[PDB]
């Protein structure tokens, strides 16, 4: 049961009220292990009460603006009442909301020598540093009241220098002046021109609303680690937080495929020593925009983050919510503005000044105000810990833990050789390196690498001779039948110099000699070059010369004329009568010579930017590629494909060898017939069609098509050529709920398709996956560099196995290009295809197509 557009967006809403409950609150708290002098302690609380003014002051409306109303004698608020009871009152605590037209602005909770002393402030009159100041009078407070009785133990000795609202009325003065416009010139030049948004790979696409539902993983770098840094900071003159930026942003840059990343800092901006013991909102954020386009060296980027690190911190006064206003005064609400990345780096003056005071550890945190947040402090031990938290709508915890593993590995390269370039460190744990590479092409399948494909369809001839085969317009052969055609067609092709690796141009409109040709061709031992009439004539003349065939064989009615000594054979009518006294018996093996390694047939590209290229394809490869959809889709003898796929382009070679390697019929749909809607459902439930494929296209105009309800008949529809929307899969779900969708992939010269993904989810993704790759064939998804790529991040897909086709016919040069060895497979002499695709790998090992690489 699903919500309405309605619901959804105020529930969304509703929570981000949610939001503004307790992330402007400053929680804390301490541990107490010694005598109990609560006497001493409320004193101690009520001291730092009245001394620090902004603890005492409520906020009112008094016409049309907010003023502060500063109160007098101030008593702290305490409530009286293992780890499920201290977790819960811990962050319901935190989550507490306080009133600030009434206040009080800080509170404090405490139960039963151990107790809790847990505090909270509102983030109006405080922040991070405020607690460091709270918790250090705190232990000041109760030391000096425990030892003997004071009254002002704070107010004489250590006073407050300025206050709070001295401080408003200086920056009140200080927004108005030059000084202001100053360093707004500085962050409108530094940033213009940033990206808007972070590229990051995600796991789900990013909601219209941003989610604020986080969750958070732990880190930490460990004493080697951490002392390789701090000398690499030192001999680099940065400090341990500038190196961590630059390493992290030249991850994310790596990651997301942009030249350049902003990330945001949390800073103290109480440079003045005035303001270092005060309590209040001090807290800024800057922006920094670190660039890596030029491919640097180490060195190189750590003097630019150190660079523009010390321009960023002496450019701090100014507010960022100005910088925003300046720089995005139109800006989405999906994310956050300038940055989506927080780095705060958090220190270790003095600790635990009272007597037995342990610093409680902050609860894991569960609000993500932006997609992630680093924060790391350096430790007693000299070890860097911390958490990352993320955004739990965006990433998955896994795709997180191996964030924080990229991290840590990019900065022990740049510890082991500062002077190498950043962006080439190798990040990939071997774990993750061994799942992309290998687990997830776990695709070794034994299938008999001695079998033309002719001899799949002459194999399943024994098995049912008097079976239907192939079936056109009224007139239909059975396997016998179809065989004993092309065997005589193959015995005239052998007598004009067909065989092994020669080619024999095939010239014809749809109808039961299309197929008779081709299996003759391969019979023959001789590779079927399909040249379709439609095409014009100066392409149709350009393929002809280009394939050099030994026969066209050509349909009575075409016109198309060869010369160069190429013997010209008719199809069909009554001049294909003489090889009709062919007898019907095969040719034997060894009569034709044809051997798995040689060429099945040399489809053209499409040539739509020059000459189109003859793909030259071998015999073991599209024997694997049929066993493999077998395996996948169990086509049953009763069962009809229809062949409605132009056979210039090689779908058509599943639909042609497909049934007649297991059985089933083909029907041979009327030339054109794909184009007409009513033609099409017509011959789909005539013909009791099971399995036809379309490009997604062309499966938006079936689903629109009048009756396609009727084709309740249909079993299987294979899509593949186009991007294959979520929105047409489901479309085609409410039109026919028993059809099975498979999404394929894969291009010419790696044999037809490689990858497959069945749509069978209950929720289907907006973009369907292209999938997992088929049997026996590898994928690769590879940097400029060659390297493989983290997990979701796009990069080149890369085919391997033995689907990879022999090369472009004529083109040693682009096929030494795009051809290139196998450094993966251990098989000597093994070839990946470039395929100029971009794509990435998904969380759950299927691939997703991208687009073109250019």
């Known amino acids: 049961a699903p919500l309405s557009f309605a619901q959804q967006r105020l529930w969304f809403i509703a929570q981000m009220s949610r939001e503004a409950s307790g992330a402007y609150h400053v929680p804390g708290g301490l541990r107490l292990r010694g005598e109990l002098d ?4 409320r004193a101690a609380l009520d001291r730092i009460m009245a001394r620090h003014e902004v603890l005492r002051t409520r906020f009112e409306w008094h016409e049309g603006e907010p003023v502060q109303c500063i109160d007098a004698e101030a008593r702290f608020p305490l409530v009286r009442q293992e780890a499920a009871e201290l977790a819960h009152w811990q962050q319901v605590e935190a989550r507490s909301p306080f009133d600030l037209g009434t206040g009080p602005l800080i509170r404090g909770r405490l139960l039963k020598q151990e107790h809790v002393l847990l505090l909270t402030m509102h983030h109006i009159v405080s922040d991070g540093w405020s607690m460091s100041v709270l918790a250090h009078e705190l232990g000041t407070l109760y030391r000096a009241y425990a030892q003997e009785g004071t009254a002002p133990e704070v107010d004489p000795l250590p006073a407050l220098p300025l206050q709070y609202a001295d401080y408003a009325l200086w920056q009140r003065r200080w927004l108005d002046g030059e000084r202001q416009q100053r360093q707004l010139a500085y962050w409108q030049q530094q940033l213009a021109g940033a990206p808007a948004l972070v590229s990051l790979p995600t796991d789900r696409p990013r909601p219209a609303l941003q989610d604020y539902r986080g969750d958070s993983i732990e880190l930490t770098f460990d004493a080697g680690l951490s002392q390789g840094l701090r000398a690499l900071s030192q001999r680099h003159g940065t400090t341990l937080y500038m190196t961590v930026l630059a390493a992290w942003a030249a991850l994310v840059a790596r990651l997301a495929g942009q030249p350049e990343v902003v990330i945001g800092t949390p800073v103290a901006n109480r440079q003045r020593a005035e303001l270092e013991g005060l309590i209040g909102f001090f807290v800024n954020t800057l922006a920094l925009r670190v660039d890596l386009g030029g491919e640097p060296s180490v060195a190189g980027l750590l003097a630019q983050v150190r660079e523009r690190v010390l321009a960023a911190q002496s450019h701090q006064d100014l507010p960022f919510e100005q910088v925003v206003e300046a720089l995005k005064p139109e800006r989405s609400l999906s994310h956050s503005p300038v940055f989506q990345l927080m780095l705060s780096w958090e220190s270790s003056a003095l600790q635990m000044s009272p007597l037995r005071a342990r610093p409680l550890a902050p609860v894991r945190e569960r609000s993500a105000q932006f997609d992630l947040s680093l924060h790391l402090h350096e430790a007693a031990d000299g070890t860097v810990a911390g958490s990352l938290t993320y955004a739990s709508a965006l990433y998955e915890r896994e795709t997180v833990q191996r964030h924080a593993g990229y991290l840590k590995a990019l900065l022990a390269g740049m510890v082991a050789d500062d002077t190498q370039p950043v962006q080439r460190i190798g990040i990939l744990g071997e774990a993750e390196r061994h799942r992309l590479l290998v687990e997830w092409n776990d695709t070794a399948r034994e299938h008999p690498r001695t079998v033309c494909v002719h001899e799949l369809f002459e194999q399943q001839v024994e098995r049912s001779p008097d079976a239907v085969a192939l079936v056109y317009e009224g007139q239909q052969l059975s396997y016998r039948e179809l065989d004993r055609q092309a065997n005589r067609l193959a015995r005239q092709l052998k007598a004009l110099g067909v065989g092994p690796d020669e080619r024999v141009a095939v010239c014809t409109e749809r109808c039961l000699e299309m197929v008779v040709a081709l299996l003759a061709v391969l019979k023959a031992g001789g590779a079927y070059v399909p040249l379709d009439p439609g095409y014009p004539a100066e392409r149709l003349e350009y393929m002809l010369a280009d394939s050099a065939p030994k026969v066209l064989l050509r349909q009575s009615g075409q016109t198309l004329e060869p010369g160069a000594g190429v013997a010209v054979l008719a199809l069909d009518g009554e001049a294909s009568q003489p090889w009709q ?137 294979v899509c593949s050529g186009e991007a294959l929307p979520g929105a047409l899969a489901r479309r085609l779900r409410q039109q026919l709920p028993q059809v099975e969708l498979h999404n394929l992939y894969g291009p010419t010269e790696a044999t037809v398709d490689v990858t497959a993904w069945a749509c069978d989810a209950a929720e289907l993704p907006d973009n369907i996956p292209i999938g997992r790759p088929v049997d026996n064939t590898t994928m690769y998804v590879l940097d400029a560099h060659g390297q493989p790529v983290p997990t979701g991040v796009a990069g080149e897909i890369h085919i391997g196995g033995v689907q990879v086709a022999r090369g472009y016919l004529g083109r040693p040069e682009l096929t030494r290009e795009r051809f290139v060895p196998d450094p993966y497979a251990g098989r000597p002499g093994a070839r990946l295809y470039k395929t100029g695709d971009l794509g990435r790998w998904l969380l759950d090992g299927t691939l997703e197509y991208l687009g073109r690489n250019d």
């Not at 609560?38 to 302690?41: F, I, K, N, P």
């Not at 459902?681 to 013909?687: L, N, Y």
Request: with cysteine; glycine share 10%; charged share 20%.
């Open 38 to 41: 609560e006497v001493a302690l």
């Open 581 to 717: 006294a062919q007898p019907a018996q095969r040719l034997s093996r060894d009569d034709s010579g044809v051997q798995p390694h040689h060429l099945a047939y040399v489809i053209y590209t499409s040539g739509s930017t020059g000459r189109p290229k003859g793909v030259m394809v071998e015999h073991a490869g599209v024997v694997n590629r049929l066993l493999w959809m077998q395996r996948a889709y169990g086509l049953q003898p009763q069962e009809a494909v229809l062949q409605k796929t132009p056979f210039g382009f090689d779908v058509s070679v599943w639909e042609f060898f497909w049934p007649l390697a297991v059985g089933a019929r083909l029907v041979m749909a009327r030339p054109q017939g794909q184009q007409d809607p009513a033609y099409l459902v017509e011959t789909i439930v005539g013909q009791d069609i099971g399995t036809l494929h379309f490009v997604p296209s062309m499966l938006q105009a079936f689903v629109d098509s009048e009756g396609v309800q009727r084709c309740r008949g249909v079993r299987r529809i």
